[PDB]
Amino acid sequence: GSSGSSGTEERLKEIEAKYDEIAKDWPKKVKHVLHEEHELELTRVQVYTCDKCEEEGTIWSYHCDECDFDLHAKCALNEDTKESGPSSG
Numbered sequence: 001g002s003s004g005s006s007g008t009e010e011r012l013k014e015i016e017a018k019y020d021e022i023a024k025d026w027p028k029k030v031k032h033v034l035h036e037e038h039e040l041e042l043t044r045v046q047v048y049t050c051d052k053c054e055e056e057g058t059i060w061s062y063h064c065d066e067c068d069f070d071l072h073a074k075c076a077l078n079e080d081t082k083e084s085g086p087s088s089g
């Protein structure tokens with residue numbers, strides 16, 4: 001025979017794969033400066049508020065299961081990219 005069925009939420013299988021491709025190089029644990037104490041853990045988040053650059057990330061946010069610190073994928077990756085950079089002298 002042949003019959004049809006309906007669909008439900010919380011079943012994002014393909015979608016997830018997409019994001020992963022974006023964070024293929026992105027590390028699982030980052031060592032931020034403001035939270036140097038511990039290394040955040042890239043946690044999947046729909047929306048949040050970065051406590052570094054004062055922005056809002058999506059489908060990506062460095063969360064810590066110890067202090068609950070959220071950050072941006074890029075913000076965490078980089079160290080000092082606000083005004084100055086790596087220079088010797």
Ligand SMILES: [Zn+2]
Binds near residue numbers: 051052053071072075
């Ligand atoms: Zn940020």
Ligand SMILES: [Zn+2]
Binds near residue numbers: 067
């Ligand atoms: Zn922490």
